[PDB]
């Protein structure tokens, strides 16, 4: 799962070079917060307060996206945690979320 998160980081790195025009456009609502890791080029139309919509250094909802991906990866049942590796799946998900928070601690910045 950490290798899958590293593959997601590699996908973010591959997306981090093929974006000449990164700004608001048709189809950028979810990509306005989804453009944190996929940081586009610095928008010329931004003012001196350009660090809110085109310079958003808020990779805390990326933890929410990792939580959504962990909840949608495998359906955690209500009785599959009787052993020490069923809630340990949630512990590994928390470790992956900590690694994602450390990785996206300076994503847009």
């Amino acid at each position: 799962v950490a290798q899958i998160c590293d593959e997601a980081l590699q996908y973010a790195a591959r997306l981090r070079e093929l974006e000449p025009g990164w700004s608001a456009t048709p189809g950028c609502q979810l990509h306005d917060a989804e453009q944190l890791w996929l940081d586009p080029l610095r928008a010329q139309t931004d003012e001196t307060f350009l660090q809110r919509r085109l310079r958003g250094d808020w990779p805390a909802e990326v933890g929410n996206r990792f939580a959504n991906w962990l909840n949608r990866a495998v359906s955690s049942d209500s009785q599959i945690l009787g052993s020490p590796e069923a809630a340990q799946w949630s512990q590994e998900l928390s470790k992956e979320l900590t690694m994602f928070k450390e990785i996206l601690e300076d994503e847009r910045d």
């Binding site: 290798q3 590293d6 593959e7 980081l9 973010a12 790195a13 591959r14």
Partner: protein
């Protein structure tokens, strides 16, 4: 043989017309000994005047194509070639085949020098980066500076001196510029315990990597076995079987003041890793050593984990 005073990264070492085969049993990414010789020659033409010392290399292998083609939909490949010039009789030349690839790499090294002891930082880094693009590395010329020069100037990132938490954040301040590649490290202990663990049929040694570039399965009496990565053989050193010689003993050497030994190839395997899944970036260097008591002229990655 030690972790460096400071690292040195070169982010898009875009090279060109490389050697693909590099050994008689593979054709993909070239030998790591080519890169260790590359940095020995860089040390020879730089560090005798700038007083540094280079031991290990770091491969990341961003993108890699090969001039290969598929003949008529078979389960094989061929090579694209280059036209040799005309023979003296002037009909056609003795055409000889070799693989030629066009890859992308970025090399991080290991320094025992005065890059911030008696010289300044980006002066040393800039002179080494400016001087590196005048020499070949795998039989192929480096594609020089272009629009890829725009991220190319670098720091000279120290490791041995700093805060511990900033040791972490400096090595992952070096990881942030290294994402879409996949680093090459050896699996020497995995070679050892994966031939020794699987010795329940026969004790042969060269059958290890000869039985890994394939889909091993003992199927249902449809379940593809747990691949642990990218199992692929690499040329992992040089066994010199015959004894030493002299410049006057065996003639037709290159220089007549250095001895000659006929040598053969050696095959370990090297996994491909994303740079996130390491212990530290000083734990992945391809060093060099020679044991002339043996025949083993073998390079290695000490402490890959």
């Amino acid at each position: 043989v030690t972790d460096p005073e400071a690292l040195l990264l070169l982010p898009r070492l875009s090279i060109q017309n490389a050697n693909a085969i590099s050994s008689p049993l593979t054709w993909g990414f070239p030998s790591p000994g080519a890169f260790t010789g590359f940095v020995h020659a860089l040390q020879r033409r730089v560090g005798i005047s700038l007083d540094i010392e280079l031991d290990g290399v770091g491969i990341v292998c961003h993108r890699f194509e090969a001039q290969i083609s598929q003949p008529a939909g078979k389960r094989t490949k061929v090579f694209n070639l280059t036209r040799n010039p005309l023979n003296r009789d002037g009909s056609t030349a003795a055409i000889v085949e070799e693989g030629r690839a066009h890859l992308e790499v970025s090399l991080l090294l290991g320094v025992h020098g005065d890059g911030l002891d008696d010289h300044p930082a980006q002066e040393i880094a800039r002179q080494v980066q400016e001087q590196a693009g005048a020499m070949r590395l795998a039989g192929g010329s480096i594609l020089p500076w272009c629009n890829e020069r725009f991220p190319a100037p670098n720091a000279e990132l120290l490791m041995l001196g700093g805060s511990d938490e900033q040791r972490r954040k400096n090595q992952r301040r070096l990881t942030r510029r290294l994402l879409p590649g996949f680093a090459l490290v050896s699996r020497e202990a995995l070679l050892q315990q994966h031939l020794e663990t699987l010795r329940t049929t026969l004790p042969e040694a060269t059958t290890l990597d000869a039985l890994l570039d394939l889909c091993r399965i003992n199927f249902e009496p449809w379940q593809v076995r747990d691949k642990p990565g990218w199992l692929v053989p690499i040329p992992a050193g040089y066994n010199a079987l015959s004894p030493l010689y002299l410049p006057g003993e065996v003639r037709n050497a290159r220089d007549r003041e250095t001895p000659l030994r006929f040598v053969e190839n050696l095959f370990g395997l090297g996994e491909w890793l994303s740079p996130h899944r390491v212990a530290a970036l000083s734990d992945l260097l391809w060093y060099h050593h020679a044991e002339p008591d043996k025949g083993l002229y073998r390079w290695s990655t000490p402490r890959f984990v």
